[PDB]
């Protein structure tokens, strides 16, 4: 136990590190403590990335309340004094993550860290800005204890002769400004103006943050660019468990324009900041200024290390005012006309999509974009333009279909398949050929996407010309879903075969393939397979029912005979899927199942209890007014898990099942008298519990039981 942990920690410290941390977190949660602490201390002393990652992975999994907080606080302060490389950034995030766990000493630690960071506020200023930002993100409430000193400290640390230090201070200042605005404007404006009159990137960054905070209209466009069903559906029968800136705007715009015009070739940090500040000013302050901004962007468009920044700025200006870029869009199109054919290209597609949001320019620009390459940004931009502006849907579809057909003729092929299954197109030739990639290619990644797109490409589902092909391609999916070596490919195939394919999976030949999947080594596939046959059982009972009766006894055999907590938890979960999916068949089998589960609850492990209680929830819905003789002996078991709960276990399931077996049985007003504590404890759960899901469930239980008058409450004490 300790030897493997020590070996894994050393391997992670020296994708391997991420895999080791994930495995350690899973093993620690499933499950020694002294050995882990000694290994962490040795790793932290020696390397640094592995020790921080191991501590972060163990944070929030083992369950340290105060003991782990004290040990981590000393370690966090050790790496705070010295600004180590980018690897130490994870340690700062790990410290913030630990402080966000919600411990009693977290507030004291945050205040102590803030005071230490204030003194530091470039091996000290840069670390303090990152630490302050992490604390503010993790604990916004604790970051508001001392905000006046932070602003004064930031105003002096940002004036230091550094480039990367100002980036952290600007991010920290923006986070503090956002928190203040969510719940100082004059002080920020005065400080920026004083520094405006090395002092290029810092001044622009402060002004950019104020403009973004004052006006969020341009921020939405930037977020969208960076990223790139029905009200009448009947519920399922058995639901399973689930100001100052605006006044000083013209002066700021004039000062920014003068700086951009003057510092054209004198200053790359300033050039990047100028382009970023230009989109904010254009959106906030909307023709000499617009023409000057376009000219500056055009000059920097051809400049090195500035085309990407200029392309984003040009698109933002076009979105702000369509008339300003009505005639200036041709310059961007002409520049990108020969740039696409020549092939860095990620920003080219982003600029076109941003400027698009008139209908004739994209008619010919589609061809240059097609030859640019197959990238996720290009597909996202083209799809967004077609949905937002369907000027030529056929032209966009024809180009995408032509490129997809040529690509599939002979990792890049995987993206082409995803695009075909992404949105609707205008296809019987593709599905026949799509059934050849996974049968020949040995790559695991390509088969995972090939399986998903086949199901989504089967939309045409009374003529004997398309029934044969859909029944043919469905055969291959069943074969791959049961004859693939790694479980990852098999899992996605069975998930694709959703309720939509109910009418085609009832065939005799298709049923045999599903019957094999019931007895599989991995539980994730057995859990999915049993759910599918349960729905399919009501369609062809001549085949499924004879096999299910043997299976049903085996599930109940494991509950009693096998004295293993893991097996009993495993079988109970599968039982819930069968009843929640085929209620009619399980209805006559209430007595053998309920009695087995009741005896399980009175055994003289959190895993089993959380599953048997959920299963009883579905059993109380299938058998209406029949589960009447067990309610009296079931309230005692459930109520003890709520009232006088010695362990702070998961009470959401117990609360959910308590209100689920009273809305169907009809036991409503009587329980308030036999148990003169149920009303009191439910009210106490409102203040004590903070989870939104639990709170919305306690209200429902109160409504279902009744609204008895206060006098009867006094009689029942």
């Amino acid at each position: 136990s300790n030897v493997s942990v020590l070996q894994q920690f050393a391997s992670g410290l020296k994708r391997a590190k991420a895999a080791k941390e994930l495995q350690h977190y899973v093993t620690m949660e499933l499950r020694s403590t002294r050995f882990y602490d000694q290994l962490n201390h040795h790793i932290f002393e020696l390397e640094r990335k592995g020790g921080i990652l191991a501590i972060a992975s163990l944070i929030g999994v083992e369950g340290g309340n105060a003991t782990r907080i004290g040990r981590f606080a000393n370690y966090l302060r050790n790496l705070l004094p010295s600004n180590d490389p980018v690897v130490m950034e994870m340690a700062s995030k790990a410290i913030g993550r630990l402080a966000m766990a919600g411990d009693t000493f977290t507030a004291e630690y945050v205040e102590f860290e803030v005071k230490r960071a204030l003194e530091w506020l470039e091996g000290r200023r840069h670390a303090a800005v990152l630490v302050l930002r992490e604390l503010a993100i993790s604990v916004p409430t604790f970051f508001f204890q001392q905000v006046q000193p932070f602003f004064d400290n930031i105003f002096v640390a940002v004036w230091d002769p550094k480039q990367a230090i100002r980036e952290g201070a600007v991010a920290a200042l923006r986070a503090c400004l956002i928190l203040t605005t969510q719940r100082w404007y004059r002080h920020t404006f005065e400080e920026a103006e004083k520094g405006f009159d090395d002092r290029i990137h810092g001044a622009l960054l402060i002004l950019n943050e104020l403009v973004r905070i004052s006006s969020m209209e341009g921020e939405r466009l930037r977020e969208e660019m960076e990223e790139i069903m029905g009200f009448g559906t009947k519920p399922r029968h058995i639901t399973p468990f689930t100001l100052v800136e605006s006044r000083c705007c013209r002066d700021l715009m004039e000062e920014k324009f003068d700086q951009v015009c003057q510092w054209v070739l004198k200053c790359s940090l300033i050039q990047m900041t100028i382009l970023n500040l230009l989109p904010r000013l254009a959106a906030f302050r909307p023709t000499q200024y617009l023409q000057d901004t376009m000219n500056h962007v055009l000059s920097c468009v051809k400049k090195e290390k500035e085309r990407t920044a200029a392309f984003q700025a040009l698109g933002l200006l076009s979105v702000a005012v369509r008339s300003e870029f009505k005639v200036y869009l041709p310059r961007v199109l002409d520049i990108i006309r020969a740039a696409l054919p020549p092939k860095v290209d990620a920003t080219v597609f982003t600029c076109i999509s941003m400027l698009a949001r008139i209908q004739q320019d994209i008619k010919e620009l589609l061809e240059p974009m097609l030859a640019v390459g197959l990238s996720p940004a290009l597909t996202a931009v083209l799809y967004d333009l077609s949905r937002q502006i369907p000027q030529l849907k056929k032209d966009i579809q024809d180009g995408l279909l032509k490129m997809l057909s040529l690509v599939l003729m002979h990792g890049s092929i995987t993206l082409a398949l995803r695009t075909l299954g992404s949105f609707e197109f205008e296809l019987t030739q593709f599905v026949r050929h799509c059934a050849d990639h996974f049968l020949n290619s040995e790559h695991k990644e390509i088969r995972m996407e090939a399986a998903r797109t086949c199901s989504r490409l089967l939309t045409p589902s009374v003529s004997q010309t398309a029934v044969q092909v859909v029944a043919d391609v469905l055969s291959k999916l069943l074969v791959v879903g049961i004859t693939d070596p790694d479980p990852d490919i098999r899992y996605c195939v069975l998930a694709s075969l959703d309720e939509r394919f109910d009418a085609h999976l009832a065939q005799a030949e298709n049923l045999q393939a599903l019957f094999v999947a019931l007895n599989d080594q991995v539980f994730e596939i057995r859990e999915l397979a049993i759910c599918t046959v349960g729905r399919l059982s009501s369609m062809n009972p001549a085949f499924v029912m004879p096999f299910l009766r043997k299976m049903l006894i085996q599930i109940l055999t494991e509950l009693e005979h096998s004295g293993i907590g893991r097996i009993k938890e495993q079988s109970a979960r599968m039982l819930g899927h069968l009843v929640s999916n085929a209620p009619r068949l399980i209805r006559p089998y209430m007595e053998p199942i309920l009695k087995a589960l009741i005896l399980k609850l009175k055994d003289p492990n959190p895993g089993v209890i959380n599953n048997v209680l959920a299963t009883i929830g579905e059993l109380a819905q299938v058998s209406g007014l029949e589960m009447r003789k067990w309610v009296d002996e079931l309230f005692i078991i459930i109520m003890d898990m709520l009232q006088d709960s010695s362990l702070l276990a998961k009470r959401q399931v117990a609360l959910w099942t308590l209100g689920q077996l009273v809305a169907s049985t009809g036991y409503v007003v009587e329980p308030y008298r036999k148990y003169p504590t149920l009303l009191e404890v439910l009210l106490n759960f409102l203040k004590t519990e903070q989870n939104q899901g639990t709170r919305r469930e306690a209200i429902r239980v109160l409504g279902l039981l009744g609204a008895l008058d206060p006098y009867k409450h006094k009689v029942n004490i």
Partner: peptide, 29 residues
């Protein structure tokens, strides 16, 4: 022997088989 004929009998509380003999494992649609 026809779908139309079976509907008439169903109104008068008479049931009938709605599958042919070519497949010995009928499936209710």
């Amino acid at each position: 022997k026809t779908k139309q004929g079976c509907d008439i009998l169903k109104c008068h509380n008479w049931d009938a088989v709605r599958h042919s003999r070519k497949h010995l494992w009928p499936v209710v649609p």
